[PDB]
Amino acid sequence: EMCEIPEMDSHLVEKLGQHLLPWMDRLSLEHLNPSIYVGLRLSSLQAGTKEDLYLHSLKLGYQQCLLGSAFSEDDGDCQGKPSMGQLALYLLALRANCEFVRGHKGDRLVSQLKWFLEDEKRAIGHDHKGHPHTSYYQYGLGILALCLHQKRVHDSVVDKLLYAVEPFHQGHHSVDTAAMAGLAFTCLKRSNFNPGRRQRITMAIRTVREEILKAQTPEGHFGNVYSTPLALQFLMTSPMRGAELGTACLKARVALLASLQDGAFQNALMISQLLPVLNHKTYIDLIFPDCLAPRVMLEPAAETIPQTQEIISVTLQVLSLLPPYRQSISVLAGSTVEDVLKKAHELGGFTYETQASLSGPYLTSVMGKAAGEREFWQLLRDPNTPLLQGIADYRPKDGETIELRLVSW
Amino acid sequence: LVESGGGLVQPGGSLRLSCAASGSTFSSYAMGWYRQAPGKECELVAAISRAGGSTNYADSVKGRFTISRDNAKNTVYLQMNSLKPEDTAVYYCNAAAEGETNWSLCEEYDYWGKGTRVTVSSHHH
């Protein structure tokens, strides 16, 4: 069976797009997002000439920050950004404009990304006994981005991703990680790159297919609501012999419709991963894309119109510190977790740090403790339930407890 | 840790090899027992379908070795009966490729685990 997602209501798709539109005007290095550009170009929607300026800004920032003087003529210090994973997404952005990475600037960017994979391959080891410094998600993304531009990686690079899905790897990969690996493998297979691994790549695609389908929840999502978009992108790209893939994907469409109606998709990166699916496209369409299909011009959404809000109380707790932190914080209803953290700081006795990411603000330090290697600050709500959204998107209710927990992964 | 069960035996003796896989996808793979004899190249000895329904043996070994698996424990077994000197080798567990007449992935792997050494010799006592 094939994974197919019948067309959704035009007004629902156009609402998703309206959430992206404010980002088309946010061109600072901190806010530029190649995933947003890719998702819009793969969608049935467009943002007009704003898209041209957005891609130009991407080219200015990614090339100036990573090459030569290595700072932005306009914006100054790039602060160690973009990352290599972000560079891979920039390469997808180029395919979304029917461009190949090229010239002496592009050739050097390609080798930087290849060095990233080589460095991760060395971190993992011929042994497979080490860990990537970033993640297997980024490792797969880097392989995908190169493959889309017809750039080869060595069998020994691909082996680390193969091993991670084969029967001897340790630990458990999320649906999102498995999906991105599957997308990388699919590009290699379609391109007949790495024929010295022809069969292991074929087997790996099937394995990912099976593991994603086994992760389908009763509500129909693959893993969770925010894993379903990339899971569907992977599943749409190959048939699955002897399985009920078609009904599995229809069950996911139901779950997505419910989640969409419930307001689940407001994060720009998450929207950017979902819009291709709702246009029957995936990142694998960037091998030979049709970049000039008609797309509907988006219009601005109604202006917010802020209203009267009651005060609420949220308990913020950090038990990963000695002495522990626990305080009741009052904020306006509809405030985000980040707003709670700002108030806690303003009251005294609390501090934290964030860094920018394509998903928004990422919490990196709490009360002077910065997360170290393979650690992170996990966000949870009562009872012992990890959030599915970040500090700038989760809006807690009165009486809720938000916990920040130091976790090793 | 992965491969175990090897040793030194008389001709006609028996051994049982175990291969414990740490990974969640074990059930998604055909598995094979492979061997590298002193001075020789990689050879698939026996392979088994994902479920256990179909098997595949090198001619040298049919009737004497039996491959089985336990997906509940993530383990593949090789029962080696009536051992011959020519079975002397290091034995390795790895994936295999189900096929209609299973098949070796010897040429698609460049990393093998430690394996487990099997030696069959008359001279032993």
Place this chain on the structure above:
Amino acid sequence: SCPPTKFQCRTSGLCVPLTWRCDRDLDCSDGSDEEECRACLAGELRCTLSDDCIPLTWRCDGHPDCPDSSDELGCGTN
């Protein structure tokens, strides 16, 4: 419409740094910026005319990883 710190692409009107003018790469879609112009570690390989080191696995892999393209020279048949 662009500042004099920048080169203005003729067709799009978009601005690029002046150092992208006449640098061989076509940074404007219309090419307007290029008009009317003038040991390594074990397992690595050294670029011929640079101090750059690459993995030996990047030799003859289809992409020039060496600025002088030496890693892709001499990759054909005998």
